[PDB]
Design an enzyme around this catalytic site. Structure first.
Site, PDB file in Angstrom:
ATOM      1  N   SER A 267       0.883  -1.198   0.000  1.00 26.25           N
ATOM      2  CA  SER A 267       0.000   0.000   0.000  1.00 26.25           C
ATOM      3  C   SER A 267       0.913   1.238   0.000  1.00 26.25           C
ATOM      4  CB  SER A 267      -0.941  -0.015   1.189  1.00 26.25           C
ATOM      5  OG  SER A 267      -1.683   1.186   1.263  1.00 26.25           O
TER       6      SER A 267
ATOM      7  N   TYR B 148      -1.681  -0.219  10.695  1.00 27.20           N
ATOM      8  CA  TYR B 148      -1.537  -0.453   9.238  1.00 27.20           C
ATOM      9  C   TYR B 148      -0.267   0.256   8.742  1.00 27.20           C
ATOM     10  CZ  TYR B 148      -2.979  -1.410   4.392  1.00 27.20           C
ATOM     11  OH  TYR B 148      -3.043  -1.850   3.095  1.00 27.20           O
TER      12      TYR B 148
END
Lengths: 249, 249, 249, 249
Positions: A136, A149
């Site tokens: 990501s 995250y």
């Protein structure tokens, strides 16, 4: 019979989104695909593409040893692993609960390391192997209220480099993709439930040079390329698939 | 008949090394290839693949307008530009001469910008376009006694991002590859003429996770991928093709 | 008087190396320093600089809540936290044991997150606060047989960015330093126990543009700068203190 | 007496903005400051701090040789150079004029290289020296319609690393700062002349974690730090001074 003809390909989080698109892409190129997921609907994705399904909780180190041994058995060889499965735990360091944080690290960072070690031992047998980690843009940067995250994807990026150095002797290449905003069911649910869904989607599109969301298919194309022998001199690389998101502000 | 079937592809520095390998790779996938070079031997590369040759000095802004007009005419359309040609001028800032520095910037940084603007105006007509810039690990880092090359490649990396933003509205994607040590004729000549050729080559190999030199073919595969519609959500990216060189020490 | 006159400064791993140099540097600028370490010799460092010592195991979430509450009590305020304490577990993903890997993540990545949240709640009271994380070049790159450290430092780098976003509203700045090879007792033990200690040290020195090891003092100067109001518009930054190590290969 | 007591400091673009703030900061720490600028008001900045002024056009290689010789004469020594002066040319690669592009490269990239070489030859005499290059977040990323600035700052960043390697042997450290949006007279004029000045300023502020513009003074603090012996193990570094701008989107 295609680019991955008779190759054994493991894919985590294969039931929906990028994982499903990756499993589909490898099958289309003649791969023997083993996919795992928590969600039992994973069964119907494997059926649909002529591959194997395994219900796995990647949080459990025993369930991870299990998944690789059974997949290697089912496919008869392992050539490619894709670490795609990830979870998040909403909150800053101020608001996140420690057990939630620890769970996100186990799945997003420990599980990919573990699985890469397990799959690597199977890749030794035939010719060369390849691992692709799905990160990501949120591994190279931060967003508000998403500490677990951000931290785990930062770790995944540097784990990709570590695995590239350590596994080169076994003829295994290791790379990552860093997707921008991808129009998966989850992102469409989030947009749909926002107060002004069209304004939300326009704001997200406007962050990308291409002024549109990515398609799961477009991430899978990058993954196939990096897992393929066309990429035979590419290892340690972090490839953004973000329509220009990380090239500007 | 292939991935670039009927597409017009411009390639600079196409006579030898990575440029030749790129021209060959595009032709293999059914591209109409126009390649330019200072070297007149470029003629035999174009003949060999069924493409057009133009003897161009990219230092000259008129010779660059000329190359694109004539290539567009010869091929009947323009879909892909590859900025691959580069020069160097040995020396630190202390030892390099200003005219040498200015020439390296013109070829390595100004020429790619110019050519991207010229080729972009031709790409508007049919369906979508793509540009790939061939940098070097020596755009993201430095080596001793190579200031002009380090500076120009630094510029090329950020020009890639600038062109990605500015040309997205014209449906044009722009990315770069950053090669490690590639076994081109020039690098093999350099090794061969060093005092201990085998010690030189082993030291170069040892810098890469894969403990070997790259092949021009392996750079071209990355270029084809990034120029292809498989890369439809990749723009603004710098992709290392360095066998792990930039992942470690 | 001095630059940190009357300020409460928490420093982890303060008994030896960079931690000791940081505790000494802050005290020299008139800080109330609370330092923790597993090593009991930490007592003599605190005595020597007129600060507080706490024997703490940062692996234990209760021992971390304890450390911050008792330090805040002892100093009467908290203005600065330095996350310097870190462990490693030698081995690739192939050779490292899971519980060792998980312990390195807890200390190197979870503990800094936890402590930043605890210290932040104390920093609210007076004017502005600052956190400095001590990473390593081995957060931005990999070395062989050091997966847990590479992964945890990768996480620490992106955690620094996450904390910078999340804590900016509370007037708290968060940055990291990424040291090169620093001549601490631990690195000198490692050199001393190598087969050819002088060849080992020369190889380490030669990786830095400055062709020498760093001094713990030189890392502490960066930490003081980043914790100071001189750095009032610097947050989210990863500052290499590596004598040019990460500028080349 | 101060941190730069009796040191000769050259500063380009010293009449206004960051340059003025840097000249003021060095003088405050007892530096003999020589500053140049096109603008004749530079005279009043030098008078105000007890330093030397030179009206210079950095586009001219002769005016650059002149500036360094006369400054070295005026101050009696050179210890520090700051390459701060920069221009832009509005436009994408499509829209920018070649002579405008070439001028931006000369001032932003060639002039800093030239001046670093000239100043380095003077720094040999006494003990150690330092160069600080003032880039921008727009050296590490792009914005629309600013190709010449993006490219030149990309080059400046990699020139900083090149100069760090090449000049380390001469005991000269070379680093850059990469400022966010700084509230200089020019940026305030731009905001003021926009249709909705407050909406413009709020949008600029919102890009930074700290949700405010930088002050020229806050960039100068970073410059002093990086030029100082406190930074004795920092060379090749690009230090963002952007209130978290480059840590998120």
């Amino acid at each position: 019979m295609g680019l991955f003809a008779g190759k054994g390909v493991l894919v985590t989080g294969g039931a929906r989104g990028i994982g499903r698109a990756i499993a589909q892409a490898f099958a289309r190129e003649g791969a023997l695909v083993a996919l795992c997921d928590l969600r039992p609907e994973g069964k119907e994705v494997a059926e649909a593409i002529g591959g194997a399904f395994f219900q796995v909780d990647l949080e459990d180190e025993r369930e991870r040893v299990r998944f690789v041994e059974e997949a290697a058995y089912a496919l008869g060889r392992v050539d490619v692993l894709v670490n795609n499965a990830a979870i998040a735990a909403p909150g800053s360091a101020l608001t996140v609960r420690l057990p939630e944080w620890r769970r996100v690290l186990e799945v997003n960072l420990t599980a990919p390391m573990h699985l890469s070690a397990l799959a690597a031992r199977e890749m030794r047998k035939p010719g060369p192997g390849a691992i692709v980690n799905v990160a990501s843009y949120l591994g190279l940067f931060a967003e508000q209220e998403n500490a677990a995250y951000n931290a785990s994807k930062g770790g995944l990026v540097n784990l990709t480099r570590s695995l590239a150095l350590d596994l080169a002797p076994l003829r295994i290449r290791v790379n990552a993709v860093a997707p921008g905003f991808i129009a998966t069911e989850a992102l469409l649910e989030l947009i749909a439930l926002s107060p002004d869904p069209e304004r939300t989607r326009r704001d997200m599109e406007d962050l990308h040079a291409l002024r549109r969301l990515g398609k799961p298919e477009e991430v899978a194309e990058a993954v196939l390329f990096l897992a393929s022998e066309k990429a035979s001199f590419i290892t340690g690389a972090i490839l953004p698939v973000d329509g220009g998101l990380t090239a500007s502000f």
